[PDB]
């Protein structure tokens, strides 16, 4: 099972550059969104859920094939809340009907990283949408209520190794939980991407409490939380190494992050020899727009 990268037909940098500076335009519009988050944490969860059901065994799943927009997927109790991400991508994808689902749904992600202040993140185009049978079915998407086991276990799935699960795990820096829609209730209201996650871990008071879901999430006494596969970041061993790196190191988050999550969004998509380079968009600020 081989699905192979086919730039839409015509387009070029400037093309998809467009579609990010629609995006990114969206996102400083639409900043009352969830107590004035906005949609850039929401979008970023988005790409991540397409493309976090990818399966190296049989190259199922994946961003390629924009399942996401199916009944099957969009209903994934895994899913509960993307509804919005999708939401705000529609009109989007009514300005710019030439792009592919899966396209628009992990370029919304880049674009959210970037104009939340992350690191770039180069990005392809080509991903074709699939038909509904194509669609995996829910439970591919990982639990929450896991130990560092589970973690490393379920990321081999997706071909990330230690490095590549603590980086991800970053990502938690954005946004936070809503006890509708997860069972996980707090996180605060970020909307920069830092490596705070990783300084959180290690500086905060945690203390392990049973929400009004009935789930176990580790509370701080200045008011973030973890849940326990944040947790277990810090209970392994090799896992505390990278969060100490991380924490450390802005830099080094930045750069091991943007390879990780491009990859994320590259699993099972092949690229031809001749397909285009990896576009690196301008940010809005970068273009003074
Ligand atoms: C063990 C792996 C993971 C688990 C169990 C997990 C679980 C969760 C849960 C339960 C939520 C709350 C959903 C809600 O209540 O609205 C959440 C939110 C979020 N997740 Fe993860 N996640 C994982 C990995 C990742 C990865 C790899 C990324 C992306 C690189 C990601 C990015 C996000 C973001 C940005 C949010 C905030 C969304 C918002 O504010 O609406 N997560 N995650
Ligand atoms: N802000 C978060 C922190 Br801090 C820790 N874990 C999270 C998990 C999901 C969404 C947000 C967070």
Excluded at 44 to 50: E, F, G, K, N, P
Aim: glycine share 8%; hydrophobic share 35%; proline share 5%.
């Amino acid at each position: 099972l081989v699905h192979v990268a086919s730039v839409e037909k015509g387009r070029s940098y400037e093309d998809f550059q467009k579609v990010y500076n629609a995006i990114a335009l969206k996102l400083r519009e639409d900043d009352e969104y969830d107590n004035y988050i906005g949609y850039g944490p929401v979008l970023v969860r988005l790409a991540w859920h397409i493309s976090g059901t990818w399966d190296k065994h049989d190259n199922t799943g994946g961003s390629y094939g924009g399942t996401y927009r199916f009944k099957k997927e969009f209903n994934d109790p895994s899913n509960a809340g993307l509804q919005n991400g999708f939401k705000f991508l529609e009109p989007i994808h009514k300005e710019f009907p030439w792009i592919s689902s899966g396209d628009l749904f992990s370029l919304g992600g880049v674009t959210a990283v970037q104009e939340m202040q992350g690191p770039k993140i180069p990005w392809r185009c080509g991903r074709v949408d699939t038909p509904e049978d194509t669609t995996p079915d829910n439970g591919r998407l990982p639990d929450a209520d896991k130990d560092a086991g589970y973690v490393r276990t379920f990321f081999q799935r997706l071909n990330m190794n230690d490095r590549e699960v603590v980086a991800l795990m970053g990502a938690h820096a954005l946004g936070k939980t809503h006890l509708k829609n997860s069972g996980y209730e707090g996180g605060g209201a970020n909307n920069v991407f830092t490596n705070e996650f990783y300084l959180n871990l290690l500086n905060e008071d945690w203390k392990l409490e049973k929400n009004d879901a009935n789930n176990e999430q580790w509370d701080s006494k200045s008011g973030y939380m973890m849940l326990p596969t944040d947790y277990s970041l810090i209970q392994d061993p090799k896992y505390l190494s990278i969060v100490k790196e991380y924490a450390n190191d802005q830099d080094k988050f930045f750069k091991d992050f943007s390879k990780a999550f491009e990859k994320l969004l590259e699993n099972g998509i092949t690229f031809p020899k001749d397909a285009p380079s990896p576009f690196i968009f301008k940010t809005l600020e970068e273009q003074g727009l």
